[PDB]
Structures are given as C-alpha cells and as structure tokens.
C-alpha cells in the first residue's frame, strides 16, 4: 500500500471532503466523506500522481477550464442533448506522503471500456452501434473543440460507458489533450515544442504523423479510422505498426483515393455510404478550419435511415 492509507479522508482545494477506497494506473475508488467505507459500487474515482507529473496537470487544466458540472449542463440544455460524454470533474488537491508531493483529482466513476466489449464481440461493432457511438463522439468533439481543446487519441480503450447507463459513452484521458486555440488564437501549422506525443499509431492523424500539433480535422480523421476498425475488425496498415513511415504513407495514399480505402476495408463490394462521405468531408478541411459538425452528424443520420433506424440513442452493446 502506497500513496494513500485506505479509507482515509482527503480534502480538496474547495474544502470538499472525500474518502479513499481500493484501487480499480494509480486510480482508486472514492466517495463523499461519511461514516460508511468506500465500496465497489462507488460513484467516483480519485486519480493520484506525483506533483511534477505533466499529464495529470494538463488533464486537470482541461477539466477545470472545460468540464465544470454546470458548464456541461448549460451546453446539454442549449444544444437539446440527452447527455454529453465529457466526464465530470468533482475536485482536486495536493497530498503529501512520505516527504513526496502528489496531486489528486476526483472524477466520475465509469463502467467498462469499449475495447473490452469490442474484443468480447469478436472485434466487431454493428453499423447501428458504430453510427450511434460516432454521433455521441461528434457531440463530445464539438464541445471540446468549442472550448479550445483537441483530444488527439480517440480509441475504444478511451471510451467508457456510464456505470449505471449502458447507452451513454464518455471520452476519457485528457493527459495529452492539446489546447489548439488558446484565447481564440489557432496554433500555426507546425510542431509544438512542448508537445511530444503523436497519439496511437494505428489511429493517429496525418497531421500528427507529419510532426505538427493536432487540430480539429485530426480528431475527425482519428474518428474515421476508429469507425472502419470497429465495423471491419481491421485497418490496412495494421501489420506494419512498428514502422510509422509506412503507416503515414498508407493513410496519405488512402486519403487521396477514399474509394480505394473503401475497396480495401470492405472487400465484398459495398461499403456503408456514410463512411466514405464522412471521410470525404473531413478531407476538405483545412488545418485551421472550423468543421461543420452538424453536416457530419447529418451524414451519419443517413446511415441510420438506410438501416431502417433512427437516433434513439441505443448503443446496442
Ligand atoms: C481512463 C482509463 C484508464 C479508465 C480506467 N478505469 C476506470 N476509470 C474510471 N473513471 C475515470 C478514469 C479516468 F482516468 C478519468 O480520467 C476519468 F475521467 C474517469 N472509472 C472506472 C474505471 N474502471 C472500471 C477501470 O477498470 C479502470 C481502473
């Protein structure tokens, strides 16, 4: 046992009290302070890292600037959404242990990640599941982009289900999130010297492959590769992950001819029409261009109509 003494009470910077539970890297179950011990049904998690941990500071800044409970609620009301998949930030603080300094952050507790469900379903999601997931991810992306951040690492292991509601998906991990537009000033098309990360090789954007800072189009492109991987179980460059030059070369060539990507990914003739249209729309985006999120959602909604369905918010997992 390190970091915390189990069952101990911790006080955040806003003087809110929390009790620490068992682990579930260094993440523990947590709940509001009370006479009860923290159980397995806990609604919160406490993430703890040394004070000098860069990703936890970055993540904390994202949450403090963009994921305040009320800030998310105002967006849900104005956009008439059922929910928003941005995890709620409950508080943070500093904790000293054995002469060492740590930073902690209280967040929403979630259920399983999509990567596990994906693997348990023989590495496939139905067209209904993919479209319903992507509509919710487009809601998240629009929100974080409108709050000056890009994620840069969208993937099934970073998508968590609501602990009590299996039809609500959340995008997590903002440790390597990037503030692309501080104070409304878009970053230039160049490398960010502070930024060292390039995302997950199989899903990362061409921009990240070219060593430039991630932008909005990059998040949309990553989602495009996720959709293909989910529908088919594969990506064309999957057996060459060790070589980034190869992966970038393939993505670049496939971006030039999306019909060829469709033919490679969906060998038996027809590919779902909305995927090619989505990729073609993302392809038209300039580096600093604001995406037209509603047109991207409209492309996906036509996918739901084609399969005799509608956006009823059912993930079908
Ligand atoms: C982020 C990955 C590593 C998920 C890790 N993760 C869980 N995370 C959360 N909430 C959570 C974790 C975070 F890091 C966050 O930034 C956040 F906003 C929310 N709930 C439940 C679990 N469960 C069941 C697990 O099995 C593991 C430990």
Residue numbers in the entry: 20 to 43, 49 to 341
Reported in the publication:
Members of the Vaccinia-related kinase (VRK) family of serine/threonine protein kinases are present in the genomes of all metazoans and those of poxviruses, including the family-founding member vaccinia virus B1R1–6. Here we present the first crystal structures of the kinase domain of VRK1 and the first crystal structures for ligand-bound VRK1 and VRK2. The ligand-bound structures obtained here for active VRKs are in a closed, active conformation and display the same overall organization previously observed for the apo-structures, including the position of the VRK-exclusive αC4 and the structural organization of conserved residues that make up the kinase hydrophobic spine36.
To understand the ligand binding site of active VRK proteins, we crystallized them in the presence of BI-D1870, the top DSF hit from the commercial library identified here. The most complete VRK13-364/ASC24 model contains residues 21–46 and 48–341 (chain A); and the one for the VRK13-364/BI-D1870 complex contains residues 20–43, 49–341 (chain A). Finally, BI-D1870 is seen in two different poses, supported by distinct hinge-binding modes. Both poses only loosely complement the volume of the ATP-binding pocket and neither pose induced the folded P-loop conformation, most likely due to steric effects with P-loop residue Phe48. Structural comparisons of the solution NMR structure, where residues (346–354) within the C-terminal regulatory tail occupy the ATP-binding pocket, and the ligand-bound VRK1 structures obtained here reveal that changes in the ATP-binding site are mostly limited to the protein DYG motif and to the P-loop. Overall, binding of small molecule inhibitors to VRK1 repositioned the catalytic lysine to facilitate the formation of an ion pair between this residue and the conserved glutamate residue from αC, one of the hallmarks of the kinase active conformation. Our data show that BI-D1870 also targets the active VRKs and that this compound could serve as an advanced starting point for a specific inhibitor of these proteins.
